[PDB]
């Protein structure tokens, strides 16, 4: 409030939680060694009109041959950042290898199809992993001629993503199955002319498309990590197949399905994990947290304070009081007493006083305070009278009570130079 | 200092953005408070017409007793209301007989209950112990003696 | 079927010089009235509403000022002003009393109007039917940071206050309010209310059980007209639905991506490294802030509308309940002889004891 | 209001969530209350 003399009241302030104590890290026990040193170390990788496709599953990815590397001419991760790739377990992902010039690499992009990526192979702007490229003028460039390998540059219409057709049509604008080169009848295929002598844009570069099947099967490849135990009913961390997080775990009560993993209660939350080694539990990421407001009588009786926690049931209160994960941590700090009711929760500095007064401090739901002390509430001046036959209250003397009433007339006439 | 060019102006437009939005935020809540306060001010003038400029016959709107007078006082952005009320204080315990069969017919005084049968002495106020020489003007003809309660006589 | 409108109720009269419609009998019509007293006391841990956390998220939270702080002040005002309305309506009671529970006076089985010692609920079963008329769509703890904090006043003690008012209205004489009580015997009370309507008191005695049977049959018909019946009660529920709408809207925009790659924490933290990342995060921050600002703004807008309603609510507790409010059909739609209180979740109901003279004639003067 | 008839900008508008709809809810509540109050102030004596 920015003061030194302060008066009395339920005064709200900044927020708390429980700092998460441990972590539960869950993998399956899968291990295999990827053909990274095959998919990125061989030479049999076909052309662009025959764009290759390899399947990846049940492996372990290193993500280390990639960054600690000088082999690569043109690398960028597109859907992702490379840095936190090591913390990603995927499933069943895909790569496509082919031999090109040094100029399609720019048209190798989401969108941006141009000619060859408008006639041979195609993406959305969406489902993106990474893209790797390097020169192999030292395996794939015979200045005698790479007459061996081709692409296609003729088609009716534009491409669709992730599609392959080999059919060297005797191509013609309106059908005409021909014997090319009868006139207006050609073929889409075309060689490469890759020479050992040529420059940047024209030497054969081996380029790999890195499409990442993410979170669409229970994760078969993992990154180099180590799994942990379980921790029931404690504010801790999560780290799953791709799901880290913060909160509390506890088993299910539900009707789960064999393909299934996530629950996303109202939105995008996953709500639950089928553990990657056969358990099926809930999620409660809200450990306990929220707001606090303090009660103090206001510097003219005392300076003794009392603390209102507002999202608890007095379970973890004295816990994180002694487990020491309370973000308004205190050196002025005790453990004295707690009143438990007003399901916002636990109020420290307080005793359930059975006799009740005029409700100074409006605690939550019905409960109120005094001195300090606290009761529920005296509801008002309880009398007990009723109807009468004839005897009746009549006045003979009286009173006049002039009272206040306090009303504004108008707030301040202000204004703003918006231009200054 | 370290700028010249549109990246500059990008940062500038971010400043414009945030200051614009917070500025509008200010203004919006200002108009909110203006609405709250103007409705309350409508009530205020309403009472100033009512409580101050007359004896407001509606009860407990001006004050919290019975509104004998009301005395207004200005204030910085505000106004103060001296509600000269009336609260009665000396409680009694006295008895009655509502309908009176005096000569064989029912009697109700003045619309204005409790015929004071503290030994059938007078007929009183709503709100006081008051001596009243009872008359026929302090009753009316009400048919005959059929649903009467009190049997009081000597009705002067 | 599609038409224009039967525009009202067609009749046509002109004057008559002396022959005049003069009622030789009468009627009483008690009416519903739905006044929403206090919408849902809700708050936001904005600090976790936005930004469950990364941690970088909390840095950018620092980088957009104290918006969370100001909206926390806003929410505090929101709640406290609901409470102010709640109070300012409710404990206008100087002296609380005790429910005599003898429960047949004048002519009146007052059943379910006051509650019962015989029932485990201290809530009156009329209002409990209203509770049954509520629709919707340990502790509550979402991952959303969004709370319905409990109202200060106990709903049972709401009910206690209402029943106390019912008692002290039905008892205590006309001075009930600015004073304590008067012990007036309730035929003499409602006899005195014929004088603020300004008429004789004979007809009360002439229609002792008649007005009584009018009355108790009318209450019965109120039970009839409210038990299974139509939507003419849920203005309350409209407001409730709007709260749900806004909250659901808040969550479903929390689902929204805004041109970034994902739309939720740690999912972003996968594919991100560097401030471009946090630029996208700032977009999330921006839109969430906006929607939030909009939310709380309109919460305050609703709050102004509801404070107007609350002013009406306390007003009809004042003039209409405690006295016979001479402003004609402000309270009900007759003459307003009495009106008695009833409660509601978020609201208050009233029992508008009107008065209608009724037997149309033609007699000269 | 935002792009009058659009192709991309509709998809961008969805990427701003569902805001248009919510504002229309506000619009509806406006018009609803307008003619509500029209009824309220004027349709008083239903006996024509």
Author numbering:
A (entry chain B): 290 to 660, 674 to 722
B (entry chain B): 964 to 1119
C (entry chain A): 675 to 811, 832 to 1059
D (entry chain C): 723 to 770
What wording appears in the published article?
The spike (S) glycoprotein of the coronavirus is a class I viral fusion protein located on the outer envelope of the virion that plays a critical role in viral infection by recognizing host cell receptors and mediating fusion of the viral and cellular membranes. The S1 subunit contains a receptor-binding domain (RBD), while the S2 subunit contains a hydrophobic fusion peptide and two heptad repeat regions. Among these, CTD1 is the receptor-binding domain, and one CTD1 in the trimer adopts an “up” conformation as a prerequisite for the binding of SARS-CoV to the cellular receptor angiotensin-converting enzyme 2 (ACE2).
The S-ACE2 complex was then prepared using trypsin-cleaved and low-pH-treated S glycoprotein and ACE2. The “up” CTD1 and the bound ACE2 are flexible, as shown by a 3D classification analysis that yielded three major ACE2-bound conformational states, in which the “up” CTD1s had different “up” angles (the angle between the long axes of the “up” CTD1 and the horizontal plane) of 51.2°, 73.3° and 111.6°. However, the “up” angles of the CTD1s from the ACE2-bound conformations were in the range of 50° to 111.6°. The “down” to “up” conformational switch of one CTD1 and its binding to one ACE2 did not induce significant conformational changes in the stem region of the prefusion S glycoprotein. The S2’ cleavage site located in a surface pocket of the stem around Arg797 and covered by a “C”-shaped loop (residues 787–796) is inaccessible in both the unbound-down and the ACE2-bound SARS-CoV S glycoprotein structures.
